[PDB]
Amino acid sequence: TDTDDLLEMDRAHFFHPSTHLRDHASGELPGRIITGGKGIRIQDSEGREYIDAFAGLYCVNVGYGRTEIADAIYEQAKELAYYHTYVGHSNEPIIELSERIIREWAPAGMSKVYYGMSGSDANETQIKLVWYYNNVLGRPQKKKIISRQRGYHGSGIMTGSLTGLPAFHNHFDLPLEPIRHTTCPHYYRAPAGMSEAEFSRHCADELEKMILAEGPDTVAAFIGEPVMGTGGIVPPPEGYWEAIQAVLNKYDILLIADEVVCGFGRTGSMFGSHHYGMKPDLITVAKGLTSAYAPLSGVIVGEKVWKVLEQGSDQYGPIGHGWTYSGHPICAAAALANLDIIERENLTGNAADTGAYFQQRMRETFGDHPLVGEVRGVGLMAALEFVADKDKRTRFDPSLKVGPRVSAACLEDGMIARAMPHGDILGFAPPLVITRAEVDEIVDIAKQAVDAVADEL
Amino acid sequence: SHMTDTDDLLEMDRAHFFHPSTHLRDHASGELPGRIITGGKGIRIQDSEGREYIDAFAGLYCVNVGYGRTEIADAIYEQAKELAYYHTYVGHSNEPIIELSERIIREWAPAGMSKVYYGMSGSDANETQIKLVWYYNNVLGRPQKKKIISRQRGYHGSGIMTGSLTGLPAFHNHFDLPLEPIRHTTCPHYYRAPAGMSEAEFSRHCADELEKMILAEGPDTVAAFIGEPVMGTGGIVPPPEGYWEAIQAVLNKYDILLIADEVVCGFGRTGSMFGSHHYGMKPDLITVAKGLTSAYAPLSGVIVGEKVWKVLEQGSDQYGPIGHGWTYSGHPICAAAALANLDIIERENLTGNAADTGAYFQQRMRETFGDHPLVGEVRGVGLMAALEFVADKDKRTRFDPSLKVGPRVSAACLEDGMIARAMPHGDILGFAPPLVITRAEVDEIVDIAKQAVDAVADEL
Numbered sequence: 007t008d009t010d011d012l013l014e015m016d017r018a019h020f021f022h023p024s025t026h027l028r029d030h031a032s033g034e035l036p037g038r039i040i041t042g043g044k045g046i047r048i049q050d051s052e053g054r055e056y057i058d059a060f061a062g063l064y065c066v067n068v069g070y071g072r073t074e075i076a077d078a079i080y081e082q083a084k085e086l087a088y089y090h091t092y093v094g095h096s097n098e099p100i101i102e103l104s105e106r107i108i109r110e111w112a113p114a115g116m117s118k119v120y121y122g123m124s125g126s127d128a129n130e131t132q133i134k135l136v137w138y139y140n141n142v143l144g145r146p147q148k149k150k151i152i153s154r155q156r157g158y159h160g161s162g163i164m165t166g167s168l169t170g171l172p173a174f175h176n177h178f179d180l181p182l183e184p185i186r187h188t189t190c191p192h193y194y195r196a197p198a199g200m201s202e203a204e205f206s207r208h209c210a211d212e213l214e215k216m217i218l219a220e221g222p223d224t225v226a227a228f229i230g231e232p233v234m235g236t237g238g239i240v241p242p243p244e245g246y247w248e249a250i251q252a253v254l255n256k257y258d259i260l261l262i263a264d265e266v267v268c269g270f271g272r273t274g275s276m277f278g279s280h281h282y283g284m285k286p287d288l289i290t291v292a293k294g295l296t297s298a299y300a301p302l303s304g305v306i307v308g309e310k311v312w313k314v315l316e317q318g319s320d321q322y323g324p325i326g327h328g329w330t331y332s333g334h335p336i337c338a339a340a341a342l343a344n345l346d347i348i349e350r351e352n353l354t355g356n357a358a359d360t361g362a363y364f365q366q367r368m369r370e371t372f373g374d375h376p377l378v379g380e381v382r383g384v385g386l387m388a389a390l391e392f393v394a395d396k397d398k399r400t401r402f403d404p405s406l407k408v409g410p411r412v413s414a415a416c417l418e419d420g421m422i423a424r425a426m427p428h429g430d431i432l433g434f435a436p437p438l439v440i441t442r443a444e445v446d447e448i449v450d451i452a453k454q455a456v457d458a459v460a461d462e463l
Numbered sequence: 464s465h466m467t468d469t470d471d472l473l474e475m476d477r478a479h480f481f482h483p484s485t486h487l488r489d490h491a492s493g494e495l496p497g498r499i500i501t502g503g504k505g506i507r508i509q510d511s512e513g514r515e516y517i518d519a520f521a522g523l524y525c526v527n528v529g530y531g532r533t534e535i536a537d538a539i540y541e542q543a544k545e546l547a548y549y550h551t552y553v554g555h556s557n558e559p560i561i562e563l564s565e566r567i568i569r570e571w572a573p574a575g576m577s578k579v580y581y582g583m584s585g586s587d588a589n590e591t592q593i594k595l596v597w598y599y600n601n602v603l604g605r606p607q608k609k610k611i612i613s614r615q616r617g618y619h620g621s622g623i624m625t626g627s628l629t630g631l632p633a634f635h636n637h638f639d640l641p642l643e644p645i646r647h648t649t650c651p652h653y654y655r656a657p658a659g660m661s662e663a664e665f666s667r668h669c670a671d672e673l674e675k676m677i678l679a680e681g682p683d684t685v686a687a688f689i690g691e692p693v694m695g696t697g698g699i700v701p702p703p704e705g706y707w708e709a710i711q712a713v714l715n716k717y718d719i720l721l722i723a724d725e726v727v728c729g730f731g732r733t734g735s736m737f738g739s740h741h742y743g744m745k746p747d748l749i750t751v752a753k754g755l756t757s758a759y760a761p762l763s764g765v766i767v768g769e770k771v772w773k774v775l776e777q778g779s780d781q782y783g784p785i786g787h788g789w790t791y792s793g794h795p796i797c798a799a800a801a802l803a804n805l806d807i808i809e810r811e812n813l814t815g816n817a818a819d820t821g822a823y824f825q826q827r828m829r830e831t832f833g834d835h836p837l838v839g840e841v842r843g844v845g846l847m848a849a850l851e852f853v854a855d856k857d858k859r860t861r862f863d864p865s866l867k868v869g870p871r872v873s874a875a876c877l878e879d880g881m882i883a884r885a886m887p888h889g890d891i892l893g894f895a896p897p898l899v900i901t902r903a904e905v906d907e908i909v910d911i912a913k914q915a916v917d918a919v920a921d922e923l
């Protein structure tokens with residue numbers, strides 16, 4: 007078959023991200039070629055159909071098969087596929103997009119957008135900017151960046167260091183200096199007997215303790231996803247963001263909001279920052295910026311950092327930072343069409359409405375399930391965490407592969423939901439066009455899967 | 464399709480768009496006016512006011528098939544309609560990325576290459592390289608063997624670790640770079656070589672400097688050496704005769720991996736398939752971007768040799784799935800753009816054009832500028848070339864940087880409708896035209912440059 011020939015070429019020549027390299031190459035872990043899709047459904051090269059309740063990777067937010075977006079990419083590609091944006095050069099779509107991000111989407115007090123292609127390159131830029139900012143101000147020691155356990159901020163050297171999951175550290179010598187990781191903001195794993203408000207205060211106090219141990223004048227920034235994505239779909243505890251921000255303000259520490267997942271509608275607000283009342287100095291975007299139709303990332307720079315960057319150019323000349331593809335015309339054109347759709351179909355409001363329905367349905371269906379320790383989520387992201395003992399929150403032996411098994415049972419029933427890393431967790435992040443009826447279908451399939459695995463154990 | 468309201472767009476630009484590599488205050492205030500590029504065809508681009516320019520820099524060494532390829536726009540469009548995106552994590556794939564991987568390995572990359580890993584930028588690809596080099600040494604039980612040796616004036620990206628690799632001060636100053644464990648050895652620029660050394664002697668001097676560095680560091684602590692076959696952003700600097708052979712012998716003696724950064728030289732520019740082919744390099748790892756898609760869509764590649772690949776597979780045995788991935792790794796539309804780009808390069812034999820019209824280019828530049836009083840050196844290979852300007856040709860004396868001699872020659876070219884780059888940290892005029900360029904277009908470029916160089920020479 008054509009699939010067999012392609013799979014063969016794949017195994018012989020393609021190094022996949024996040025794959026068992028030996029077992030892929032040998033054919034021990036079979037591959038899958040995705041060829042098409044529409045709305046929330048995708049299709050493989052053998053014609054099999056799947057409900058994609060993970061929207062690729064939290065990213066195909068307007069759904070699959072938007073010919074509107076393909077048309078917009080095509081028109082830009084015909085007119086001017088590329089020019090650089092170095093030394094004040096520009097193109098029409100990147101200018102239009104920058105104005106739209108600032109005026110209509112980003113929180114108030116944001117000033118400028120800098121572009122790359124990945125969440126990783128955007129967070130790399132953030133770190134560079136934070137160091138530069140402190141050097142411009144004559145604070146050479148104020149450089150440490152505090153991230154969080156289970157946070158996800160990319161897969162590079164410095165960005166993998168920010169990331170708080172061991173797969174991105176082990177055997178890569180990370181994290182490097184000067185990165186630190188504070189408390190995982192996951193109430194389910196809070197110290198025993200803590201209320202939610204107590205746990206938010208515990209997180210704040212642990213951060214303070216870290217800042218004092220480091221010396222506050224050496225701590226430049228704090229980076230956090232409003233809701234943790236890859237670390238297990240973890241909304242923050244009640245009062246967390248207010249308690250954290252008071253500590254950061256007390257010690258003059260910049261806040262970076264990593265909105266790569268929460269950006270552009272997924273929580274039911276425009277950004278996760280809007281949803282939780284965060285006031286970041288710097289914002290990272292990607293994924294839902296284009297619904298993955300073309301690669302694009304953004305660093306949204308607040309007025310306070312921007313003023314210092316302008317001061318920096320006065321004293322030091324043009325900023326020594328650029329990517330060849332910064333502000334790429336076709337990627338910008340894809341973003342514009344994507345945002346047109348999000349606005350026109352009010353997918354932010356759908357994420358709030360169908361999302362609340364999703365969360366309610368998940369709680370009803372799984373809140374008393376013997377296998378499920380916690381049901382959590384906000385808007386159109388949700389997860390089920392599985393435990394061996396609900397009373398003591400005891401984890402399964404990782405060799406039992408409980409999460410991966412529930413995910414595999416879902417896939418047998420034609421639905422894609424992710425076995426989240428470093429845990430037994432089933433995550434959902436469907437396209438923002440999903441209907442309530444489609445939510446029912448997803449929940450029903452998950453219910454059958456969770457039951458099947460529970461019976462086996 | 465539609466005219467552009469230039470004044471209004473320029474205004475929105477200044478108020479909201481943070482450009483790469485721009486004077487941020489002067490851009491925002493309007494003191495450095497912007498330029499909006501709206502169109503292009505072949506080697507010419509057009510701004511929003513309708514002005515036309517010959518782009519002798521191919522954007523940034525990247526628009527290699529030339530501008531306005533509707534064939535590539537069609538291929539992007541067909542993939543975007545069929546499947547704009549899915550991830551390639553856990554063995555998932557798409558048809559164009561599989562096809563591209565096979566074509567890169569079987570038809571383009573040097574012998575002994577095994578696999579391709581994908582990103583979107585030269586910078587993210589070199590970031591992947593460093594991760595892979597450290598992982599490789601950890602798999603082998605050599606935790607100390609981690610240092611990466613780069614070179615003065617080398618260019619490898621604009622990130623934290625990649626900017627550290629980069630050997631130009633603009634990417635270091637006020638960013639606290641370079642970090643450990645990066646080192647920089649000798650700039651392979653013969654024009655600035657110790658006086659009275661032949662080219663081959665200077666190659667041996669560079670080899671000996673590298674060896675000295677390795678011994679001072681302790682060879683068991685040195686993991687890899689990274690180099691562009693020909694330096695791009697560091698001033699269009701072909702290596703001296705014998706350089707790559709002499710370097711490789713040192714790297715082999717001390718079990719040090721070679722990374723070839725082919726972001727510029729990859730896919731035809733030197734008149735060979737890769738710079739590695741052209742100079743007889745045998746890299747363990749290869750970085751590509753730019754000419755991989757002719758910039759029609761963002762894509763980068765890390766080409767992994769058989770020796771590193773074997774250890775990566777061994778690593779998976781020991782440690783499980785590799786903890787590395789970008790969301791857009793193997794992006795379908797970017798892969799489709801690459802395939803159409805490579806079809807054009809192969810069909811029109813742009814590698815051969817780069818050799819033929821390139822040799823003509825180099826010869827024409829020598830004839831025109833080899834005795835010019837302002838020009839210390841004419842250099843290049845294939846379709847990259849530079850003029851380096853000096854205040855005294857006998858002693859190779861540099862101009863006071865405040866005279867801005869390089870920027871002024873570039874600005875005079877632009878007045879005459881041609882884009883050629885004032886290269887950073889020196890007085891150097893660089894050329895890297897699209898690979899479709901004709902001899903006739905080379906004559907036009909050379910003539911414009913001649914007038915520009917004469918004009919600035921008169922002013923001094």
Ligand SMILES: *Cc1c(COP(=O)(O)O)cnc(C)c1O
Pocket residue numbers: 064123124125126127158159160161231235236264265266267292293788789790791
């Ligand atoms: C996916 C993700 C990233 C990394 O983006 P890439 O485009 O994969 O580099 C960064 N931060 C968060 C919060 C993400 O979810």
Ligand SMILES: *Cc1c(COP(=O)(O)O)cnc(C)c1O
Pocket residue numbers: 328329330331583584585586587589618619620621691695696724725726727752753
């Ligand atoms: C341009 C360049 C890079 C970085 O590529 P980006 O796509 O700009 O990140 C790396 N290496 C070399 C030799 C380059 O010319």
